[PDB]
Design an enzyme around this catalytic site. Sequence first.
Site, PDB file in Angstrom:
ATOM      1  N   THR B  29       2.263   8.811  -3.228  1.00 11.90           N
ATOM      2  CA  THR B  29       1.395   9.256  -2.147  1.00 11.90           C
ATOM      3  C   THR B  29       2.108   9.260  -0.797  1.00 11.90           C
ATOM      4  O   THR B  29       3.143   8.617  -0.623  1.00 11.90           O
ATOM      5  CB  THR B  29       0.141   8.371  -2.042  1.00 11.90           C
ATOM      6  OG1 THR B  29       0.534   7.004  -1.863  1.00 11.90           O
ATOM      7  CG2 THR B  29      -0.700   8.488  -3.303  1.00 11.90           C
ATOM      8  N   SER B  30       1.541   9.995   0.153  1.00 14.44           N
ATOM      9  CA  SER B  30       2.048  10.020   1.516  1.00 14.44           C
ATOM     10  C   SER B  30       1.921   8.623   2.117  1.00 14.44           C
ATOM     11  O   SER B  30       0.967   7.902   1.824  1.00 14.44           O
ATOM     12  CB  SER B  30       1.253  11.034   2.346  1.00 14.44           C
ATOM     13  OG  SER B  30       1.888  11.299   3.583  1.00 14.44           O
ATOM     14  N   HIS B  88       8.512   3.811   0.036  1.00 13.35           N
ATOM     15  CA  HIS B  88       8.005   3.160  -1.161  1.00 13.35           C
ATOM     16  C   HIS B  88       9.164   2.395  -1.776  1.00 13.35           C
ATOM     17  O   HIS B  88      10.321   2.618  -1.417  1.00 13.35           O
ATOM     18  CB  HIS B  88       7.478   4.184  -2.170  1.00 13.35           C
ATOM     19  CG  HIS B  88       6.214   4.862  -1.744  1.00 13.35           C
ATOM     20  ND1 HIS B  88       5.035   4.177  -1.535  1.00 13.35           N
ATOM     21  CD2 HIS B  88       5.938   6.165  -1.502  1.00 13.35           C
ATOM     22  CE1 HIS B  88       4.092   5.029  -1.175  1.00 13.35           C
ATOM     23  NE2 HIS B  88       4.613   6.242  -1.148  1.00 13.35           N
ATOM     24  N   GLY B  89       8.865   1.497  -2.702  1.00  8.64           N
ATOM     25  CA  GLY B  89       9.919   0.762  -3.368  1.00  8.64           C
ATOM     26  C   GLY B  89       9.453  -0.071  -4.541  1.00  8.64           C
ATOM     27  O   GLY B  89       8.263  -0.141  -4.842  1.00  8.64           O
ATOM     28  N   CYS B 130       7.460  -1.796  -0.932  1.00  8.13           N
ATOM     29  CA  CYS B 130       6.992  -2.647  -2.019  1.00  8.13           C
ATOM     30  C   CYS B 130       8.180  -3.251  -2.773  1.00  8.13           C
ATOM     31  O   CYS B 130       9.260  -2.658  -2.823  1.00  8.13           O
ATOM     32  CB  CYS B 130       6.111  -1.846  -2.983  1.00  8.13           C
ATOM     33  SG  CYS B 130       4.453  -1.455  -2.353  1.00  8.13           S
TER      34      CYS B 130
HETATM   35  C1  LIG Z   1       4.494   0.427  -1.838  1.00  7.88           C
HETATM   36  O1  LIG Z   1       5.456   0.610  -0.797  1.00  7.88           O
HETATM   37  C2  LIG Z   1       4.825   1.275  -3.086  1.00  7.88           C
HETATM   38  N1  LIG Z   1       5.913   1.209  -3.771  1.00  7.88           N
HETATM   39  C3  LIG Z   1       5.940   2.127  -4.936  1.00  7.88           C
HETATM   40  C4  LIG Z   1       4.537   2.434  -5.535  1.00  7.88           C
HETATM   41  C5  LIG Z   1       4.614   3.441  -6.702  1.00  7.88           C
HETATM   42  C6  LIG Z   1       3.898   1.139  -6.070  1.00  7.88           C
HETATM   43  C7  LIG Z   1       3.659   3.002  -4.402  1.00  7.88           C
HETATM   44  N2  LIG Z   1       3.725   2.075  -3.305  1.00  7.88           N
HETATM   45  C8  LIG Z   1       2.751   1.848  -2.348  1.00  7.88           C
HETATM   46  C9  LIG Z   1       1.517   2.454  -2.224  1.00  7.88           C
HETATM   47  C10 LIG Z   1       0.682   2.066  -1.169  1.00  7.88           C
HETATM   48  C11 LIG Z   1       1.094   1.082  -0.243  1.00  7.88           C
HETATM   49  S1  LIG Z   1      -0.051   0.668   1.060  1.00  7.88           S
HETATM   50  O2  LIG Z   1       0.697  -0.012   2.098  1.00  7.88           O
HETATM   51  O3  LIG Z   1      -0.842   1.842   1.362  1.00  7.88           O
HETATM   52  N3  LIG Z   1      -1.086  -0.455   0.309  1.00  7.88           N
HETATM   53  C12 LIG Z   1      -0.459  -1.570  -0.465  1.00  7.88           C
HETATM   54  C13 LIG Z   1      -1.469  -1.900  -1.553  1.00  7.88           C
HETATM   55  C14 LIG Z   1      -2.036  -0.540  -1.900  1.00  7.88           C
HETATM   56  C15 LIG Z   1      -2.182   0.138  -0.531  1.00  7.88           C
HETATM   57  C16 LIG Z   1      -3.556  -0.109   0.103  1.00  7.88           C
HETATM   58  O4  LIG Z   1      -4.583   0.132  -0.863  1.00  7.88           O
HETATM   59  C17 LIG Z   1      -5.874   0.113  -0.402  1.00  7.88           C
HETATM   60  C18 LIG Z   1      -6.836   0.523  -1.331  1.00  7.88           C
HETATM   61  C19 LIG Z   1      -8.190   0.549  -0.987  1.00  7.88           C
HETATM   62  C20 LIG Z   1      -8.594   0.169   0.291  1.00  7.88           C
HETATM   63  C21 LIG Z   1      -7.641  -0.242   1.224  1.00  7.88           C
HETATM   64  C22 LIG Z   1      -6.283  -0.269   0.880  1.00  7.88           C
HETATM   65  C23 LIG Z   1       2.345   0.454  -0.351  1.00  7.88           C
HETATM   66  C24 LIG Z   1       3.144   0.863  -1.410  1.00  7.88           C
END
Ligand SMILES: *[C@@]1(O)C2=NCC(C)(C)CN2c2ccc(S(=O)(=O)N3CCC[C@H]3COc3ccccc3)cc21
Lengths: 237, 238
Positions: B29-30, B88-89, B130
């Site tokens: 995702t973005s 991402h990571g 991550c």
């Molecule tokens: C993280 O950097 C990362 N590494 C790789 C992979 C494929 C796991 C995607 N990814 C990722 C996605 C999203 C984030 S974030 O900072 O947007 N955050 C971290 C936990 C999920 C997300 C927030 O999710 C919600 C969901 C519902 C309501 C509020 C927040 C970080 C990383």
Amino acid sequence: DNSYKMDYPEMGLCIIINNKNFHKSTGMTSRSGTDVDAANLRETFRNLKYEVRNKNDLTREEIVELMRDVSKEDHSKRSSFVCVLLSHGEEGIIFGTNGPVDLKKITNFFRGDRCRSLTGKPKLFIIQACRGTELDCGIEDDMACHKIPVEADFLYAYSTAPGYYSWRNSKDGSWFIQSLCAMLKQYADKLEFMHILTRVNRKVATEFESFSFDATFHAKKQIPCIVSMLTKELYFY
Amino acid sequence: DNSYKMDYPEMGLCIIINNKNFHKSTGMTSRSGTDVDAANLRETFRNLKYEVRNKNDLTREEIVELMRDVSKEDHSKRSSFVCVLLSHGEEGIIFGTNGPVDLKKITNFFRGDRCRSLTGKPKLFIIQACRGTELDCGIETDDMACHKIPVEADFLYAYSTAPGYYSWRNSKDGSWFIQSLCAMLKQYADKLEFMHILTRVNRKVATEFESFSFDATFHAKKQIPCIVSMLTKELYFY
Ligand SMILES: *[C@@]1(O)C2=NCC(C)(C)CN2c2ccc(S(=O)(=O)N3CCC[C@H]3COc3ccccc3)cc21
Ligand SMILES: *[C@@]1(O)C2=NCC(C)(C)CN2c2ccc(S(=O)(=O)N3CCC[C@H]3COc3ccccc3)cc21
């Protein structure tokens, strides 16, 4: 505040696991000089006023049981906790006398949510062990104060960089423990812990170089690896 | 001595890699809010007298070539080196727009033996990404001295999060870690040693942030950054 509260009735426990002799069935070599390390650590932390407990040649299951039992004690009157692991290792693992143990498994017993009497207190793990077999050839909405992370307030003082060998001398003990004890003795009463460990880093990096009749093990170098999830400064005085 | 020499003509480069949009092939995702991070950092390090170079949406290939190229520059007149990775990571990995890059591969270009003009100088890598998918639910309150140095000596890795864990980011304010890092640098760069600044970052992230979500699985979660130091001296920005 900015510094951990270190004026509890007791500084805390310092558990030293000293694995020197390993099950013949594993084929792991004896760790000569580790007794020098254990003695050195015992004296250094005794002087810092920790309750030192030495253990020798424990199996993987004995290590887990010891940590589990220790994590179940009441540390309410203790400022901190220290565990020292002296053994063979690989990345993320230390060896019991009979086989590998994941470091996560050991440290997990002390998580913010699994050991309540150490919540908010510094949990120090000092690890003298290989993290692999690479050799370094060298060169030249307000929710504040509601909760804390379960992984917070840990410090992992690794003897060496991820993936690398950790060096030990039969006469003087390991480079890292040797340097750590010396720096603690010299600076525990005037430097914050991270600054003490930085001097350990420099001492190990600059003053040690292997000498060997085997070219493969000759002229090698080492850098320790400080991993801090601490939220405050730590002074031993 | 006790502190790195930071009075070279230049403080040094600050490379900011800002990856927001990813190829559909990756399925990631973005990264909303990352632009806020990148601007915050640019300004923060500008005030510290670093030569900032922002890069946006680089492929894994471009990241390697960029790092190789930068490592081949003459840093003789520069006190230090800073690289910030926003992406991402997973554990040990950072994502280019088109796939994963091993972090070691990136940092190796700057090893003591492969970048001589930086040998003995502090090499700082700041990683907002991550390191796995775990969530933190929290809890309520002879004489060969100085002949050589290790090749992996004088690196600092300021990770946004603990090994194995998610790293949190807010679409409006940016990531918890970068927000806190820039704030603590702005406030304390002129009076604290770098490890102590990072420790205040640790505390700020740990105490002042907590997730809110209609989804129980992502709600009330916490984060602790992870300071990894192979530094041999104290680092002051004055
Ligand atoms: C993280 O950097 C990362 N590494 C790789 C992979 C494929 C796991 C995607 N990814 C990722 C996605 C999203 C984030 S974030 O900072 O947007 N955050 C971290 C936990 C999920 C997300 C927030 O999710 C919600 C969901 C519902 C309501 C509020 C927040 C970080 C990383
Ligand atoms: C290290 O802790 C370790 N972890 C697991 C495994 C299987 C890699 C075995 N292992 C190990 C073996 C030996 C040492 S040491 O401190 O004795 N040292 C490190 C480099 C080899 C050895 C010294 O060897 C020589 C050989 C000739 C002359 C001088 C020294 C550490 C660990």
